[PDB]
Amino acid sequence: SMQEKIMRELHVKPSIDPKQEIEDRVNFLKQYVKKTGAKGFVLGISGGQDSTLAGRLAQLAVESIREEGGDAQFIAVRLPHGTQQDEDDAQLALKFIKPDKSWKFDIKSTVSAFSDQYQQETGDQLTDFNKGNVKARTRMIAQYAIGGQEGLLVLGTDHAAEAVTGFFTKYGDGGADLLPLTGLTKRQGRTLLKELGAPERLYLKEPTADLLDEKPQQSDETELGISYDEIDDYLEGKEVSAKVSEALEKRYSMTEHKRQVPASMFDDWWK
Amino acid sequence: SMQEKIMRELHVKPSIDPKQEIEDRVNFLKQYVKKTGAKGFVLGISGGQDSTLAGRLAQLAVESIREEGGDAQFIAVRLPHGTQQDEDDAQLALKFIKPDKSWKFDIKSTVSAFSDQYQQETGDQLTDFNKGNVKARTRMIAQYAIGGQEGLLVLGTDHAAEAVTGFFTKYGDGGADLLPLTGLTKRQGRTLLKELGAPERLYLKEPTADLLDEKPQQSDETELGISYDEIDDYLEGKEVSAKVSEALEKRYSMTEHKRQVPASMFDDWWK
Numbered sequence: 001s002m003q004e005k006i007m008r009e010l011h012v013k014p015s016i017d018p019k020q021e022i023e024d025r026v027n028f029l030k031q032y033v034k035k036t037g038a039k040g041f042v043l044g045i046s047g048g049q050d051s052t053l054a055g056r057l058a059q060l061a062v063e064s065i066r067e068e069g070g071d072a073q074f075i076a077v078r079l080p081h082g083t084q085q086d087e088d089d090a091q092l093a094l095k096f097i098k099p100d101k102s103w104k105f106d107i108k109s110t111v112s113a114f115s116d117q118y119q120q121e122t123g124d125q126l127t128d129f130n131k132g133n134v135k136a137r138t139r140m141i142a143q144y145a146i147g148g149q150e151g152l153l154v155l156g157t158d159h160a161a162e163a164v165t166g167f168f169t170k171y172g173d174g175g176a177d178l179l180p181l182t183g184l185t186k187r188q189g190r191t192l193l194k195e196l197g198a199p200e201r202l203y204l205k206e207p208t209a210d211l212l213d214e215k216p217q218q219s220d221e222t223e224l225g226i227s228y229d230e231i232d233d234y235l236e237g238k239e240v241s242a243k244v245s246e247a248l249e250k251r252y253s254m255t256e257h258k259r260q261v262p263a264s265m266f267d268d269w270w271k
Numbered sequence: 272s273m274q275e276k277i278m279r280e281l282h283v284k285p286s287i288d289p290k291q292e293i294e295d296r297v298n299f300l301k302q303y304v305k306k307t308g309a310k311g312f313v314l315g316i317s318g319g320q321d322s323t324l325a326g327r328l329a330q331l332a333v334e335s336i337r338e339e340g341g342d343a344q345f346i347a348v349r350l351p352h353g354t355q356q357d358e359d360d361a362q363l364a365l366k367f368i369k370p371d372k373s374w375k376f377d378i379k380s381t382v383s384a385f386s387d388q389y390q391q392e393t394g395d396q397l398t399d400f401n402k403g404n405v406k407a408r409t410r411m412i413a414q415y416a417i418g419g420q421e422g423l424l425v426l427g428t429d430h431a432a433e434a435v436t437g438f439f440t441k442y443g444d445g446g447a448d449l450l451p452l453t454g455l456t457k458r459q460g461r462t463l464l465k466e467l468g469a470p471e472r473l474y475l476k477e478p479t480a481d482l483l484d485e486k487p488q489q490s491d492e493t494e495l496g497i498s499y500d501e502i503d504d505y506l507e508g509k510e511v512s513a514k515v516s517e518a519l520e521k522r523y524s525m526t527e528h529k530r531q532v533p534a535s536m537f538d539d540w541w542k
């Protein structure tokens with residue numbers, strides 16, 4: 001079925017061993033640093049589940065490298081746009097991750113400069129939606145600037161429950177160097193956080209991209225019209241209602257471009 | 272040999288028919304955009320060879336779509352950082368391209384806001400090299416904002432002679448939706464642009480990324496330490512010095528991450 005195909009392509013298991021998943025994903029981070037001579041990692045810590053998980057895995061990886069006599073560091077970075085309404089949760093995430101370094105970059109003045117220039121040049125105010133994608137891409141710029149200045153790789157938090165819907169900004173939070181969470185469903189990420197001892201508030205809250213000025217903290221499920229339990233059931237190979245398979249297979253097909261390098265005439269996937 | 276592998280991976284031909292390259296690449300643009308249902312294309316026009324070529328191909332594609340009774344448009348956009356020293360060549364490129372629409376977005380206030388915030392937040396001056404990548408990524412943001420507002424796809428200008436060296440900013444000018452120039456060597460692209468009727472001032476224009484404040488208009492060759500005709504010889508399967516081949520093969524491996532989606536543990540290309 002298409003469901004089986006999507007599961008295979010997104011690397012999803014129906015059942016996991018959380019300890020082994022953690023080992024595999026920390027080992028990946030370590031191996032990628034060994035092979036490339038990298039100095040460590042940078043990651044935006046939002047106060048949401050995914051960045052909490054990826055941040056703790058990163059911290060464990062750099063600690064393990066150092067325990068082996070090597071050199072590595074992790075910079076966690078707060079990236080509010082002005083006042084972030086769930087700053088408290090982001091601080092709690094930092095308290096749990098216990099990163100080597102905890103930095104901050106408020107993206108609002110950059111986003112405002114851009115938005116104001118856009119109207120000055122075109123006569124048009126950006127739509128809230130398009131401004132939201134400017135925010136996500138500005139966060140990419142901020143992380144790549146810290147990584148470039150400090151000699152580090154940019155982690156991304158994409159996982160299977162965002163990949164299937166294409167629920168990320170292309171060259172925004174989609175723009176990263178390496179991905180410790182690939183293949184995990186949303187529920188599976190919660191299981192890994194539990195194994196790691198995370199505070200439950202960080203995985204009980206609603207997932208949100210929090211990109212819109214007019215609809216702040218909008219839940220992903222509100223935007224998508226599909227819940228993470230539906231997504232996860234699909235991705236874990238459960239026998240789900242036909243409405244879920246219809247919705248997800250359409251979104252997956254429509255967003256393939258986000259999961260491929262830019263298309264050329266030599267590629268066949270898009271035809 | 273590794274040369275054969277790279278030539279194949281980058282879709283390079285040893286010999287081309289310039290007129291049919293033009294036909295094929297225009298047709299790619301037509302076929303792709305129609306598949307997506309997008310209204311057309313946006314592209315940053317720097318004055319340089321690659322964007323002049325890709326821009327003219329785009330304009331031909333949209334004109335062909337309209338000739339067959341469809342709807343399509345091309346927005347060419349100037350993206351200076353303040354005063355661009357070779358603005359005159361960019362204006363000449365626009366004159367040659369004859370784009371449907373001609374827009375401008377000056378990135379300087381955005382880049383200055385970012386840079387000033389970086390120093391405020393970190394206590395660290397953003398360095399010229401890292402600021403240059405901020406400029407390239409701000410250009411990406413600008414093109415995606417126009418594209419999102421106007422319903423267009425973002426063209427990229429990557430070609431084999433930049434691809435092999437990774438001579439583009441990751442998620443800057445590398446960030447695009449589709450690539451009409453894939454597989455062309457530098458001199459092959461020049462042949463297309465000449466066949467399209469461009470003046471020598473455009474098709475023999477010295478390549479530059481022009482990203483640095485301390486070294487404006489630096490030529491690519493100054494930065495790379497190798498010239499485009501050596502790169503082109505390698506890519507086209509000619510004999511080159513051990514000097515050239517060792518250097519290009521090492522750089523190709525070191526920059527594979529720029530030619531792949533973000534790495535996960537399920538990928539092996541980095542090993």
Ligand SMILES: Nc1ncnc2c1ncn2[C@@H]1O[C@H](COP(=O)(O)OC(O)C2=CCCN([C@@H]3O[C@H](COP(=O)(O)OP(=O)(O)OC[C@H]4O[C@@H](n5cnc6c(N)ncnc65)[C@H](O)[C@@H]4O)[C@@H](O)[C@H]3O)C2)[C@@H](O)[C@H]1O
Binds near residue numbers: 314
């Ligand atoms: N004024 C304009 N007006 C309108 N439009 C335009 C203008 N200017 C440009 N345009 C448009 O843009 C295109 C492109 O123009 P073009 O061809 O002239 O530009 C160019 O030539 C051009 C464009 C931009 C840049 N360049 C060069 O690239 C290098 C960047 O590498 P780099 O400086 O080192 O920076 P990077 O961020 O790309 O890569 C390093 C980062 O990568 C990650 N990393 C590293 N190793 C690694 C790994 N092993 N695994 C995983 N990740 C890893 C880390 O995060 C790390 O920090 C450095 O050498 C630069 O000088 C070139 C044109 O065709 C136009 O369309």
Ligand SMILES: Nc1ncnc2c1ncn2[C@@H]1O[C@H](COP(=O)(O)O[C@@H](O)C2=CCCN([C@@H]3O[C@H](COP(=O)(O)OP(=O)(O)OC[C@H]4O[C@@H](n5cnc6c(N)ncnc65)[C@H](O)[C@@H]4O)[C@@H](O)[C@H]3O)C2)[C@@H](O)[C@H]1O
Binds near residue numbers: 254
């Ligand atoms: N406050 C913070 N502090 C610190 N760190 C962070 C913060 N916030 C986030 N972070 C960090 O970021 C990550 C991610 O966080 P996360 O998981 O909560 O965010 C999120 O959930 C999140 C983040 C960003 C976005 N979302 C959603 O994606 C959609 C994007 O619109 P979209 O319309 O899908 O926009 P797009 O540009 O991504 O895609 C459209 C463009 O694609 C092109 N195109 C289209 N068709 C097509 C084709 N067939 N072929 C080729 N190209 C094609 C065209 O150019 C077209 O314009 C839209 O629905 C958005 O709401 C979600 C976190 O984990 C953190 O690491």
Ligand SMILES: [Mg+2]
Binds near residue numbers: 050162
């Ligand atoms: Mg997320």
Ligand SMILES: [Mg+2]
Binds near residue numbers: 209
């Ligand atoms: Mg979130």
Ligand SMILES: [Mg+2]
Binds near residue numbers: 319321322428433
């Ligand atoms: Mg170029």
Ligand SMILES: [Mg+2]
Binds near residue numbers: 394
């Ligand atoms: Mg300092």
Ligand SMILES: [Mg+2]
Binds near residue numbers: 317319478479481
């Ligand atoms: Mg140039």
